């Protein structure tokens, strides 16, 4: 580790006279596989990023617009609804969360949602 810096600074001195969707440890595509939502390909082509709200894996290039770097924090996939809620940026996250939880207790609602769909679907309004 012989560097010349000490000798130069002495020579010039003044005369101061004072998890599952990743490659294995050895490196292998885990099986069974989970694929990107846009291309249906695994982590072998490119690393996959996992949305932390829904189980949808994505590729950094398969997005629109593509991500330039890895998202360090919690990332939101483009397949959710809070994006249209983000159109109005004045309101804080607590009101948004309470609005979402207004529909978080009857999550199925399948009969009523198909019913509302056909109710709107009628071309001539009632």
């Amino acid at each position: 580790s012989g560097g010349l810096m000490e000798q130069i600074q002495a020579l010039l001195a003044p005369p101061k006279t004072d998890t599952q969707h990743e490659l294995d440890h050895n490196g292998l595509v885990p099986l069974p596989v989970k694929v990107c939502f846009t291309c249906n390909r695994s982590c072998r082509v490119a690393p996959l990023i996992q949305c932390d709200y829904c189980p949808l894996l994505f590729h950094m290039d398969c997005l629109e617009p593509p991500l330039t770097a890895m998202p360090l924090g919690r990332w939101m996939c483009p397949n959710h609804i809070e994006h249209v809620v983000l159109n109005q940026k004045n309101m804080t996250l607590s009101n948004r969360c309470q609005v979402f939880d207004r529909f978080q207790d009857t999550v199925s609602q399948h009969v009523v949602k198909v019913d509302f769909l056909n109710r709107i679907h009628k071309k001539h309004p009632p």
């Binding site: 560097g3 010349l4 810096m5 000798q7 130069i8 600074q9 020579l11 010039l12 003044p14 005369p15 101061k16 006279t17 004072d18 050895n26 490196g27 292998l28 595509v29 099986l31 069974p32 596989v33 694929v35 846009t38 249906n40 390909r41 695994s42 072998r44 829904c54 189980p55 949808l56 483009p78 397949n79 959710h80 609804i81 994006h83 249209v84 940026k89 529909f103 999550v107 609602q109 399948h110 949602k113 198909v114 509302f116 769909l117 056909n118 109710r119 709107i120 679907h121 071309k123």
Partner: protein
């Protein structure tokens, strides 16, 4: 009606999950509460159904302080903007006044240690070491020149005026700092007294300062000559290794990437992806191969065969009968499979071992071709550069090292093959082999760093390809079926013989019913051979 039920059936089938489907239901319900317009509704549903044109068309028919950007914040309105005295009309009308952009990060500094091989750090250290000494030397020399100029000016005027000459804190130069910095460096703590003497009485004080500066300059110059001698052969030992960013990673990554389990996984994953696509019913034809590789030269083929034969002929555990058998397999059967003995294809049904051998052989051939192309490019670039630099008037358009001759440049590739043979025999050390490769092919040399092991791997496959009755039965079945012409043939006659080909596949299924079965198609086109492998 039932059409809506069928639509919902196919959408929850295609989404393959309940959470994404329920998000879609939340979207349509939020629409149903009259908070969403039709165009906005389709722009929200586009993420879910952007890859099914049929589903999207069916859904369309069924329907019938402020912040901007990502890194700019608005300044407070009641914020005392710092006054400026030079603001002209264009300054007021043009300059930004309301947004201030806050750096969206905190990490202090990491340079690029992520990608800076230890050999690029030594070069950086040697550079900064050179720069410190050089900057001190050039400050001293500039001060010497300034004092020489002021002394020459002083010596030309009347003696009764010399005692009336004085100097300011610039000391005759154009800077108020640099000359004082040099004098401070020379004199340590006694610098202010010398500076006052130079400013007050230049006539008597200039020559002694000049003498001291000159003596220090000569001593520093000889020390720098010694340091220059030492700094060399560190650039030489570090330069080529600093540009090769992959060797350390590549050696281990390749020593793993060639294992049988890794090769098997590389195709099993693709098979699983295609199976999932078929399950989701996406528009993908059920005849495409899972993997595709290209052979672009026959000369590379016989070169690789010669290398493998060279290694196998020097084996102690392989008997003369097995040597002959491997010779027939390598120089006769394989070229026949590649049709060395358009729109002409060959069909082959193989087990795991033949798939491994084909993968390894393709890897070796591709690397040999890469090295060959690099050598050709180097020779062409050298010839073009010589032709260009011969015709140069340079500035009229208003030691070193001796580069190799053209003959060495065109003999690089046979020398590379001889080097590979020497490494395989064990006569040359891996370190010297790697260094010669790096000096021969610069940043494309790593492609050949782990060739011998690769060859070794291939050899093992060949040996097993003789000892396992399954493999010889496979090649015999291929030969017997080709005698009928069903396995492989002209592209047009496929539909003529297709049923017969089916029979062949049937036999494969009843010969390896406990083992993976691979369909391999060798398609010839324009001098290249495309090997397409699919798992059954």
């Amino acid at each position: 009606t039932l059409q809506e039920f069928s639509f919902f059936d196919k959408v929850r089938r295609v989404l393959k999950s309940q959470e994404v489907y329920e998000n879609f239901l939340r979207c349509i319900a939020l629409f149903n509460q009259e908070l969403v317009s039709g165009s906005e509704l389709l722009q929200l549903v586009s993420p879910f159904l952007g890859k099914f044109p049929e589903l999207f068309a069916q859904f369309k028919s069924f329907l019938g302080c402020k912040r901007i950007g990502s890194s700019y914040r608005a300044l407070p309105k009641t914020y005392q903007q710092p006054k400026c005295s030079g603001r002209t009309a264009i300054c007021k009308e043009v300059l930004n006044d309301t947004w201030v952009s806050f750096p969206s990060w905190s990490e202090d500094s990491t340079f690029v240690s992520s990608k800076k091989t230890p050999y690029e750090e030594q070069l950086h250290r040697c550079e900064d070491e050179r720069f410190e000494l050089d900057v001190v030397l050039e400050t001293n020399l500039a001060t010497i020149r300034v004092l020489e100029s002021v002394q020459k000016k002083l010596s030309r005027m009347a003696p009764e005026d010399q005692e009336k000459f004085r100097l300011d804190d610039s000391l005759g130069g154009t800077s108020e700092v640099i000359q004082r910095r040099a004098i401070y460096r020379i004199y340590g703590d006694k610098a202010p007294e010398i500076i006052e003497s130079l400013k007050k009485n230049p006539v008597t004080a200039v020559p002694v300062v000049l003498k001291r500066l000159k003596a220090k300059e000569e001593e520093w110059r000889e020390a720098q000559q010694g340091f220059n001698k030492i700094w060399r052969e560190q650039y030489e030992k570090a330069y080529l290794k600093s540009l090769d960013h992959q060797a350390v990673n590549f050696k281990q990554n390749d020593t793993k990437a060639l294992r049988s389990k890794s090769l098997l996984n590389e195709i099993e994953s693709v098979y699983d992806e295609h199976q999932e696509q078929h399950s989701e019913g996406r528009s993908a034809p059920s005849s495409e191969p899972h993997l595709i590789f290209v052979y672009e030269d026959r000369q590379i083929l016989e070169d690789a065969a010669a290398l493998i034969s060279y290694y196998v002929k020097r084996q102690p555990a392989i008997q003369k009968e097995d040597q002959g058998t491997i010779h027939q397999l390598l120089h006769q059967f394989v070229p026949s499979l590649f049709f060395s003995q358009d729109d002409v294809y060959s069909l082959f049904f193989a087990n795991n071992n033949w798939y491994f051998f084909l993968r390894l052989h393709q890897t070796l051939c591709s690397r040999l071709l890469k090295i060959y192309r690099q050598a050709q490019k180097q020779l062409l670039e050298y010839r073009t550069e010589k032709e260009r630099e011969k015709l140069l008037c340079e500035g009229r358009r208003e030691l070193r090292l001796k580069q190799p001759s053209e003959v060495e440049l065109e003999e690089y590739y046979p020398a590379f093959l001889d080097m590979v043979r020497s490494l395989l025999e064990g006569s040359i050390d891996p370190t010297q082999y790697e260094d010669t490769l790096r000096e021969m092919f610069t940043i494309h040399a790593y492609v050949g760093f782990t060739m011998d092991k690769l060859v070794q791997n291939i050899a093992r496959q060949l040996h097993h390809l003789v000892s396992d009755d399954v493999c010889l039965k496979v090649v015999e079945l291929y030969l017997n079926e080709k005698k009928r012409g069903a396995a492989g043939g002209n592209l047009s006659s496929r539909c003529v013989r297709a049923a017969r080909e089916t029979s062949y596949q049937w036999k494969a299924e009843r010969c390896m019913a406990d083992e993976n079965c691979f369909k391999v198609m060798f398609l010839q086109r324009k001098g290249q051979v495309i090997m397409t492998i699919e798992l059954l």
